[PDB]
């Protein structure tokens, strides 16, 4: 689902960006902890393309412990499975990367239109424009956040232990014995005190214990 | 000089293993020694601008870049590009010391790594086109995320000064008196409370939102 610190869990997807035609496939990875994004451009959705993409992302961000994707063949082929195994990266199929895709496309749109490109970006200007978008997204604050994704990526805040909370389970009851490690707007990461098991739950199902 | 993102050096070097895009644009941050490379079919103003935009996306925006006096660096297109980005630029003789020595060393490091990685994947001459991008990325990973020689710090460490922070910003809390007490750091916020940790006692408590303020 989500990492507690950077380079734990990434999410990756392909998305189509007609402004970047003819090579309009963008491979997008987001680090689920820092929100930093890496994007590369490709002519086709293939196993080879995703391998190049991840190698690029690793060069920028460092090597993750695990990557989550959908069921698509580029991600689950023998070639890609052996590639991930070689790099020692766990893989799951089955979101943050969806929001990353939207932010990226909005940014590409703003930058292109700013250069007078209402439709297709001229082929020779595409690489530069994509890099500019990536710079804006990683090196500038995301809306209301006080730190940029790249700052959160290299200097993350990771609580060693959190404060005690109760969580609402199933019987409608509130259960003690949990501590909160991350408390965001939508979700919270909570750890069971007896096992150190960590689960993600909606914020509304968590409240301070005492 | 001292400090990352102050002075970069950029050069183009030929790497026939990377044909047909055998011109490698190479930038090194002279403080952190971090290297970024992109490949190009020819040395043009467009290639230079793609390269620097890429390097900036990876490393951040530098104050200044030093290059030789090739037409791609001194063109009107590139002059105006640099100006739009607010980056200072100085040119020199190709190979010159004060502005090209470090990037010359980076060229050799990079080409040695490309050779070792390629021959390691069983490619003794030209690297298959479909494998080139990945191999360049792997070379950047190896050059930036591992220590150069006797260094205790990797270029990534010098560039970003990584660390893990274990608490949020300092805060002060309103205690029973009306006094605002310093010596606390916030851990998380939720449901109208802040969880705060006392720097001196390590006590962690939940405090109503309205009774917590940032400390200076």
Author numbering:
A (entry chain A): 52 to 145, 154 to 269
B (entry chain B): 54 to 269
Verbatim from the authors:
The following permanent integration of this viral DNA by the viral-encoded integrase (IN) into the host chromosome is a necessary step in virus replication. In most retrovirus systems, IN first removes a dinucleotide from both termini of the linear blunt-ended viral DNA (∼10 kb), termed 3′ OH processing. Next, the same active sites catalyze the concerted transesterification reactions of the nascent 3′ OH groups into the cell DNA. RSV IN consists of the N-terminal domain (NTD) (residues 1–44), the catalytic core domain (CCD) (residues 50–214), and the C-terminal domain (CTD) (residues 222–286), similar in size to the corresponding domains of HIV IN.
In this report, we describe crystallographic analyses of a three-domain RSV IN as well as its CCD-CTD fragment in a new crystal form at a much improved resolution compared to previous studies. Although crystallization of a purified cross-linked IN-DNA complex has not been successful, we have been able to collect a 1.86 Å resolution dataset on a crystal of RSV IN(49–270) cross-linked in crystallo to a short viral DNA end substrate (5/7 hairpin DNA). The crystallized RSV IN (49–270) contained mutations S124D, C125A, E157C, and F199K. In our crystallographic model of RSV IN(49–270), the average atomic B-factors refined isotropically at 1.86 Å resolution for the CCD, CTD, and the inter-domain linker are 35.6 Å2, 47.9 Å2, and 30.7 Å2, respectively. As noted by Yang et al., the relative configuration between the CCDs and CTDs of RSV IN is stabilized by a large number of hydrogen bonds made by residues in or around the linker segment. Given the high similarity between all the crystal structures determined in different contexts, it seems likely that the observed conformation represents the intrinsically stable native conformation of the CCDs and CTDs, rather than an arbitral conformation captured by crystal lattice contacts. We have provided data rather contrary to this idea; a particular conformation of the CCD and CTD of RSV IN is observed independently of crystal contacts, and appears to be important for viral DNA binding. Our structural and mutation studies collectively suggested a role for the asymmetrically associated CTD dimer of RSV IN in viral DNA binding. The crystal structures, combined with earlier structural studies and our in vitro functional analyses, suggest that the asymmetric interaction between the two CTDs is an essential feature of an RSV IN dimer for viral DNA binding and catalysis, whereas the highly flexible NTD is required for IN tetramerization to promote concerted integration.
